[PDB]
Amino acid sequence: MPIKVGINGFGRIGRMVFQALCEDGLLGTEIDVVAVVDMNTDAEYFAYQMRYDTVHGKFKYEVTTTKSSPSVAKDDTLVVNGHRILCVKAQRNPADLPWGKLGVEYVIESTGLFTAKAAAEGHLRGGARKVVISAPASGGAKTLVMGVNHHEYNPSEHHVVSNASCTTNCLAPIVHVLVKEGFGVQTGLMTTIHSYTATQKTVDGVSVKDWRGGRAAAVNIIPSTTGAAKAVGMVIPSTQGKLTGMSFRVPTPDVSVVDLTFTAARDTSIQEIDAALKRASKTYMKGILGYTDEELVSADFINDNRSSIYDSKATLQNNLPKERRFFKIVSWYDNEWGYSHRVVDLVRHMASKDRSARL
Amino acid sequence: MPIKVGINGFGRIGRMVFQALCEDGLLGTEIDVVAVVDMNTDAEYFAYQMRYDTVHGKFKYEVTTTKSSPSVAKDDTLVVNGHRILCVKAQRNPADLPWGKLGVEYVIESTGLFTAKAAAEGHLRGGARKVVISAPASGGAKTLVMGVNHHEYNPSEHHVVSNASCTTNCLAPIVHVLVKEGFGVQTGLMTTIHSYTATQKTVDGVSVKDWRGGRAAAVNIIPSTTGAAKAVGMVIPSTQGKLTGMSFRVPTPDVSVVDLTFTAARDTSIQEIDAALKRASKTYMKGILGYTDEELVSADFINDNRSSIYDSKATLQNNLPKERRFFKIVSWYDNEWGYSHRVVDLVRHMASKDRSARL
Amino acid sequence: MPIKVGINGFGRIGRMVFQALCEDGLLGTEIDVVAVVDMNTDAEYFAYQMRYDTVHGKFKYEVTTTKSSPSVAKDDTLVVNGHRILCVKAQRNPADLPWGKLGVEYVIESTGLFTAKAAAEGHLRGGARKVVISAPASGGAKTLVMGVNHHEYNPSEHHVVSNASCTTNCLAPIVHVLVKEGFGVQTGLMTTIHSYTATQKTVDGVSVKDWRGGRAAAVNIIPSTTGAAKAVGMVIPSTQGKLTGMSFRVPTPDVSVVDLTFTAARDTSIQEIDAALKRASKTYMKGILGYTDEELVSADFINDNRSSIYDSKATLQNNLPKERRFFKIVSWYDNEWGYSHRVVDLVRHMASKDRSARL
Amino acid sequence: MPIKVGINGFGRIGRMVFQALCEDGLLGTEIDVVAVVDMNTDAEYFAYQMRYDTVHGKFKYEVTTTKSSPSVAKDDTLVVNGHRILCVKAQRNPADLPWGKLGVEYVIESTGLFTAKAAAEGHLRGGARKVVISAPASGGAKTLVMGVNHHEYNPSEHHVVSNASCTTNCLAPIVHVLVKEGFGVQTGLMTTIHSYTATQKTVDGVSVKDWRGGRAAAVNIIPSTTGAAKAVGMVIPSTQGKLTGMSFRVPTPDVSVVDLTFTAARDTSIQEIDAALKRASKTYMKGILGYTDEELVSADFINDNRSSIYDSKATLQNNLPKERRFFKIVSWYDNEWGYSHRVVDLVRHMASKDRSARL
Ligand SMILES: NC(=O)c1ccc[n+]([C@@H]2O[C@H](COP(=O)([O-])OP(=O)(O)OC[C@H]3O[C@@H](n4cnc5c(N)ncnc54)[C@H](O)[C@@H]3O)[C@@H](O)[C@H]2O)c1
Numbered sequence A, B, C, D: 001m002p003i004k005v006g007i008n009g010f011g012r013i014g015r016m017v018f019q020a021l022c023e024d025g026l027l028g029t030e031i032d033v034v035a036v037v038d039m040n041t042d043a044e045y046f047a048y049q050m051r052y053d054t055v056h057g058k059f060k061y062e063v064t065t066t067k068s069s070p071s072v073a074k075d076d077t078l079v080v081n082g083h084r085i086l087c088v089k090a091q092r093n094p095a096d097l098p099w100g101k102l103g104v105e106y107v108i109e110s111t112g113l114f115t116a117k118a119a120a121e122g123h124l125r126g127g128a129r130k131v132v133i134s135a136p137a138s139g140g141a142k143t144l145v146m147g148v149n150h151h152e153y154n155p156s157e158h159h160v161v162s163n164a165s166c167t168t169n170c171l172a173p174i175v176h177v178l179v180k181e182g183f184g185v186q187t188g189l190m191t192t193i194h195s196y197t198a199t200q201k202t203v204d205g206v207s208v209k210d211w212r213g214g215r216a217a218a219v220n221i222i223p224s225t226t227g228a229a230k231a232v233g234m235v236i237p238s239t240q241g242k243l244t245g246m247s248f249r250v251p252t253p254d255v256s257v258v259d260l261t262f263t264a265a266r267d268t269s270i271q272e273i274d275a276a277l278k279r280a281s282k283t284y285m286k287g288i289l290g291y292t293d294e295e296l297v298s299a300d301f302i303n304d305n306r307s308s309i310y311d312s313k314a315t316l317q318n319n320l321p322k323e324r325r326f327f328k329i330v331s332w333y334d335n336e337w338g339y340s341h342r343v344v345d346l347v348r349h350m351a352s353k354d355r356s357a358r359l
């Protein structure tokens, strides 16, 4: 049985979620994407955006356009791999999307505008059953990180969920292995060296609520607060108040790295941490946590679908010799791709669990 | 008396226009910037924006803030070398700007949003007598380029003028010299290799009226139509229909170059054009047309206040030997800086011809 | 009978040529790459370089390494699809390369250092039979552009040959169709907006032969002369003395675009020209000249294996209305990828004509 | 008596050292720059390089050229406001530099190639008395960081010294304040987000000794080991074995940031650290350590003469609330400009102490 999905906000993630939703061969069989929504209804423009991606290259699937019925002005329907996706009109208010009529039960909320759970329940007002916010939520939405706490998904209780941030999805798996392996975490500070994003500015512009983020994005190292590490304390509750961090947004369009400096609860070694991470990645963290022992740079993690790619060499080489407690872990992530894949994993995990809890 | 100016839209152009008139030593003396305007009235944010510039460096003048009335919550007044500039609230419609009470005679229309002459006529309904549109104007606003036609300005018929584009300001002075020095232009195509701008996107984003323009700006060569070459045909009407061209937006935040290819109206040589261009730049085009014969690159034109800096070595080395008609001229421009100074130049020229009247 | 090939210089073009021939399924099937050469013979390093490409992503074939002899310390042999490629020690002088001992009959000369015919001829003395110089050659190497004049190749007479430059492989196809289709080129000036390259500098650095080219490559627009349009003259003899041009090296790591302004040798129209290039594209330039009518930016041309991808929209939109003689044509090229495919194409053609010649 | 200085390696640091000199009014008074050496003696080209700077703007001071003698073919002498500087030809071996003949007493060793003490001592064979290696040195060169341990300079003992790395110059002043004030450093790991440099490559190139550093610099985040934090342990011996760190080389041509994470040796708070860094910056660390509490991005530190500009807002905002031991300090540095000033200060200090010893 195909699950009926709707993507509200067809941007980097709204669209990579779709590409991710296709790359896995899921479109039309396991997942029917019933409707995607951006500003316009222009299937030709939507399709163009899908076809060509500056970072992720050309979309593997042929995208065509058609009309829902001849009484429509322009093609308002994408056709991906024979499957038809209607382009619905954006709404200032999620409550005004016609989800029920469409028969969409799962809304991927990827606008960046409705991270407030109250707003994101708008979709449930429009007829959906579940929303997955492609961002940290606010207002008590259950935050779920695949491979970390996603099994805490309660079908009967969790209707509007957050898939956390890309950064949390990179960090949390690392911290989860640290915790699960018994290294523990006294405290940690993470810095993400972060590719610039849609909210940033080509040239110095107005950014009233973040002055640095208003600065020319591709020519600056631009510091920023981030709630990603604090957010881990909500996904891995034993790390609450133990982690924070920041971001430096740097002139790359995609791919980021977590630089986690933490203190372990008891004596260990970076070697043990590195052996754990590598085993975790092979096993109970498989598909979520990867590692490389290669000399990779950011471009090499483009289209990596893991949420965290432990950089073994950068980690092993850049720690204190003989150190027992105070460690740095480097883990990469394609902030766009890894995350978008996780959204799909989440949606899929929720659907199997919604199936189980029904029949 | 003090030339009473107001800048509607404090951004790259609004600020650099301000930074240009300050730097030309005009603030307070020749020119009274009574008010500026953007989204917020947060003079502290304006001050930070003026203080720090990714391309143009730190502002040479100290900028403090104050309240205009002790009754106001946050500082809404800028102080620049002891000159007070009120930060007034943004309007969706220029007609609702308080230029009347404020005493603003000259408005600089640098929002990007009221380039429609009629729209920009709002400042007039708001209290102002003159408006300089810091972009190409639609709607029959008189386009003026300093050094080329700025003497065609008529105080009695021209109240809403365009300062044209930064690209036209680069190109028109070249074409003006070409025409005036007797070489003439039969036809010409121009390509501007252009630094990306505010309207562009850090990452592939929605740009429905300019699909290529929607694509990640700092990792792409992005072709674009430009009206700049056609616009010269307004500024130098003998060239109407004779010129067009395009833009390639490239990963630099400022500085552009005109690469004009044209066919002269008489047999000439590149050496003739070269010498003419150098002559004109020393004489009647002083301050507007500059030239270099050094091995310059885009960074070297940062903070150059000329409209057009003719590249002698690039032109002379890249033309057909012994050619009589078919030439490429290479001319640089700091698209933010030169233009901004020209805006100030235009206002200074408008004020002089508005006064002395009519004497 | 598999073509015995050695690649001298395994950088951007050395590797991309190798990747091009692998992509085309030629390795060990149609072409025996016996040896590759660079500053080292560390096959592990070669493998890493092949495996990860900033621009071109992950190589589609697995690379392994092994040892030519079990004693030989660090791995010196690449293995791709069962095929053993020796990493031979670089020589300051090509005649010292053991080509005759390796059975290499075709050398791709991709160092950038043996571009002079007499220098590349050293390969022949090292025992090779044919040399394709992966750049313009001096000293009277026959220049061959696939799809334009490669059929001029003369096995008995042409032993050291040039595949021209990426830029000439981009322009020649356009000029070729112009001349072949009866438009003609009276005069032509080209600008290529060029990606920065290996010869450029990350930060302002010493570049005695090219002052501009020493300037920080990723933050500057950097004018250059080019012999690319002038060189179309030896490939299309009728265009000799009629064409020249320049480059602006802009901050993208790969993909460039030809901006050609020409005067036709008869009244025509950009629609005629547009249609002619599309026809050529679909026919006798198939695989060499491509075209788009989409809103493509440079990233979209990454891994395009055509020489020239004519930009229909940018051309159609940026020409003088109703103009009959004076035209601009816009054509993209992945300077790395398209050219690399041509190198392989050329060797294959040459090998086919070498085979035919004597029997 | 101005000190006779030679600059061996007139690159980024070679040249910014020279700018520091002139800007500070030290030329011809404190310091005679007798010669600068790079790949040739072409003063014209030297002057072009000094004149135009992608990151630091146009040299404010006029540079002219003459010949040392009429026998010389081309200009070999820079003239900067009366001050004459001979361009001498690069020697593969410093021992062949004509220092003795020239009367050059102090050599700024800024090639990046004679960083081994024994190799830098070549300048001493060449007739110099003192070498400041403008990088970390190997082979036992005393490392000196201005404002931290520079008073440890011993005229009779230290003839070839290291002024450390740009990074250690950022870190050491912070760590110094932390140690001096009794906050202490139990363990520390730093990361530097680091502008690309001259050793990096524009496109994926060969870098056998640093695979990642071979990768395209301006399109990647490129991890790297660094000796910078470890090197603090030579400069502040109490921190030996207690600090290491790494680098992420990111796509900016200048300005870097240290992200220090450490455990204090006693209970503190980041407000107390913050307070102490500011107080030191105004007092005993003045000119070496600076601070900002503004919303600065890297562009804003371009041309900042300090070794370390502590980012009070990035620090204060991104630490654990109520944390007593485990902290992050964000400090910026213009890796080129700050450091080059430091080089100058070092030579001046060494000169001071040499006059006071040899009396
Ligand atoms: N991009 C990343 O690396 C990344 C990673 C993880 C999470 N996220 C989160 O994903 C969300 C979106 O991120 P993005 O990077 O894709 O940004 P984006 O701006 O590319 O995507 C948002 C899209 O929503 C569209 N939109 C705006 N208003 C809308 C409306 N009312 N209805 C429908 N569509 C509307 C926009 O036009 C845009 O195309 C944000 O919350 C962001 O924090 C982003």
Ligand SMILES: NC(=O)c1ccc[n+]([C@@H]2O[C@H](COP(=O)([O-])OP(=O)(O)OC[C@H]3O[C@@H](n4cnc5c(N)ncnc54)[C@H](O)[C@@H]3O)[C@@H](O)[C@H]2O)c1
Binding pocket: A204, A205, A206, B008, B009, B010, B011, B012, B013, B014, B037, B038, B039, B090, B091, B092, B093, B110, B111, B112, B113, B115, B134, B135, B136, B164, B165, B166, B167, B197, B198, B199, B335, B336, B339
């Ligand atoms: N930037 C350049 O290179 C350049 C050069 C020449 C001409 N221009 C023209 O100048 C105009 C602005 O260019 P820019 O680069 O400064 O763009 P910008 O976006 O940097 O500046 C525009 C500013 O207007 C403000 N604004 C938006 N709506 C407003 C409103 N309703 N009321 C008041 N303020 C408002 C925005 O906050 C922004 O800061 C455009 O028309 C552009 O074509 C730009």
Ligand SMILES: NC(=O)c1ccc[n+]([C@@H]2O[C@H](COP(=O)([O-])OP(=O)(O)OC[C@H]3O[C@@H](n4cnc5c(N)ncnc54)[C@H](O)[C@@H]3O)[C@@H](O)[C@H]2O)c1
Binding pocket: C008, C009, C010, C011, C012, C013, C014, C037, C038, C039, C090, C091, C092, C093, C110, C111, C112, C113, C115, C134, C135, C136, C164, C165, C166, C167, C197, C198, C199, C335, C336, C339, D204, D205, D206
């Ligand atoms: N890069 C492009 O876009 C492009 C396109 C068309 C043609 N070309 C031409 O191809 C040639 C190579 O350019 P590239 O971009 O690959 O530069 P590159 O520097 O990336 O590749 C050159 C390789 O040759 C190696 N090399 C140097 N000396 C050698 C020697 N003696 N023996 C063996 N190897 C040696 C270098 O280590 C390097 O890896 C140049 O002539 C260039 O003009 C380049």
Ligand SMILES: NC(=O)c1ccc[n+]([C@@H]2O[C@H](COP(=O)([O-])OP(=O)(O)OC[C@H]3O[C@@H](n4cnc5c(N)ncnc54)[C@H](O)[C@@H]3O)[C@@H](O)[C@H]2O)c1
Binding pocket: C204, C205, C206, D008, D009, D010, D011, D012, D013, D014, D037, D038, D039, D089, D090, D091, D092, D093, D109, D110, D111, D112, D113, D115, D134, D135, D164, D165, D166, D197, D198, D199, D335, D336, D339
């Ligand atoms: N760039 C920075 O931010 C920075 C900061 C602090 C220290 N350093 C150190 O400064 C030194 C120079 O760095 P840079 O960034 O200026 O590099 P650079 O490449 O810009 O400067 C090195 C200069 O030395 C010249 N040179 C090479 N061989 C020479 C020789 N045999 N004799 C004379 N000159 C020769 C090169 O042409 C080049 O101009 C390096 O050791 C580097 O680690 C660099």
